[PDB]
Ligand binder design. Structure first.
Ligand SMILES: CC(C)(C)OC(=O)N[C@@]1(C(=O)Nc2nnn[nH]2)CN(C(=O)c2cccc(C(F)(F)F)c2)c2ccccc21
Length: 271
C-alpha cells in the first residue's frame, strides 16, 4: 500500500524511458485524494527554462512593495540575449515588470528572465525565495543562457520533480502567495504558448491547464510542470523532467506527453 499507485506504473515508466534512451522523472499529486505517483521524483534534473518560479518570486515581492508590477523597465541592446521574442519588440520602449514576467512565463523570453533575475538579486535571490516557501531542493546558480548546459552529474540549476510539484502546489493552490497574486500566477501559466505538445497534449480538451516548459537544447533535457483542472474535480499538480547521457541526444516532447499520461493513468484519471 501507500506506494501502490507508484508501483502500478513503475514498469510502463521504465519502458518509456528505455525507448527514450535516457531518464524520466515524474511526480504527480491528486489534490483531492492526496494520491501521488512517483518515478525518479527525488532525482535532480536540469530546470532549463522551467525556472515560472521566477514570476512567482516577483509576485511575492510585489506584496511587500506597492506598484512593483507596474514599474517600467528600460533596457539596452546588450541586455538582449538569444530567443527573446517579446522583449526585443519593446527594446525602444521598455516594458513593465508584469509584462516581463508574462513574457518569461508564456514565451520563455530570455532577456525578460535575466532582467527579472537582477531585480530579485540574481539566481541566489530566486533560490532564497524558494527556501522561504519550504523548497530545500531547488537551486538556481547561473543566468540565461549558461544555466542550460545540463551537464551529467551537475547539480547546478536543478531541482527534483517532487520539489517542483510541491512548490507549484504551494504557489498556485496553497497560501505561499496572497490571493490576488496566486490568481495572477495561475493566469500567467494558463496563457503559456510553449507547452502545447507536452502536458497539454496529455489531458482532455475541456481541462483547464497552466504550465511552464523547459528545454535546455542538449543532453535530451526538456521538461514541463503544470496544474490541470479536471472539469468539476479537484486539480492535479505534476512535473515531468527528462535528461539523457549524450550531449547530442535529442529531447522528445512526445515522451513528456506520454509520461504525463502515465502519471494521470496511475492517479486514477484518464490519460
Ligand atoms: C525555437 C527553439 C526550439 C529553439 O526554442 C527556443 O526558441 N529557445 C529555447 C526555448 O524555447 N525555451 C523553452 N523551450 N521550452 N521551454 N522553454 C529552446 N532552447 C533550446 O536550446 C533548444 C530548443 C529546441 C531544440 C534544440 C536543439 F536543436 F538544440 F535540440 C534546442 C533554449 C535554450 C536555452 C534558452 C531558451 C531556449
Amino acid at each position: 500500500g501507500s506506494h501502490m499507485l507508484t508501483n502500478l506504473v513503475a514498469e510502463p515508466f521504465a519502458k518509456l524511458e528505455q525507448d527514450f534512451g535516457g531518464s524520466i522523472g515524474v511526480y504527480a499529486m491528486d489534490t483531492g485524494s492526496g494520491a501521488t505517483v512517483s518515478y525518479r521524483a527525488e532525482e535532480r534534473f536540469p530546470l532549463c527554462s522551467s525556472f515560472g518560479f521566477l514570476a512567482a518570486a516577483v509576485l511575492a515581492r510585489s506584496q511587500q512593495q506597492a506598484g512593483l508590477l507596474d514599474t517600467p523597465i528600460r533596457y539596452g541592446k546588450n541586455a538582449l540575449v538569444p530567443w527573446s521574442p517579446i522583449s526585443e519588440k519593446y527594446l525602444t520602449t521598455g516594458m513593465t515588470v508584469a509584462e516581463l514576467s508574462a513574457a518569461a512565463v508564456q514565451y520563455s523570453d530570455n532577456a525578460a528572465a535575466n532582467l527579472l533575475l537582477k531585480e530579485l538579486g540574481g539566481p541566489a535571490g530566486l533560490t532564497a525565495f524558494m527556501r522561504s516557501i519550504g523548497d530545500t531542493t531547488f537551486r538556481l546558480d547561473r543566468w540565461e543562457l549558461e544555466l542550460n548546459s545540463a551537464i551529467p552529474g551537475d547539480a547546478r540549476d536543478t531541482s527534483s520533480p517532487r520539489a517542483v510539484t510541491e512548490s507549484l502546489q504551494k504557489l498556485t493552490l496553497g497560501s505561499a502567495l496572497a490571493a490576488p497574486q496566486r490568481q495572477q500566477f495561475v493566469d500567467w501559466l494558463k496563457g503559456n504558448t510553449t507547452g502545447n505538445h507536452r502536458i497539454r497534449a496529455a489531458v482532455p480538451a475541456d481541462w483547464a491547464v497552466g504550465d511552464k516548459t523547459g528545454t535546455c537544447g542538449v543532453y535530451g533535457t526538456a521538461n514541463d510542470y503544470a496544474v490541470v483542472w479536471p472539469t468539476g474535480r479537484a486539480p492535479i499538480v505534476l512535473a515531468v523532467y527528462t535528461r539523457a547521457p549524450n550531449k547530442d541526444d535529442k529531447h522528445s516532447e512526445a515522451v513528456i506527453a506520454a509520461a504525463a499520461r502515465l502519471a494521470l493513468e496511475g492517479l486514477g484519471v484518464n490519460g
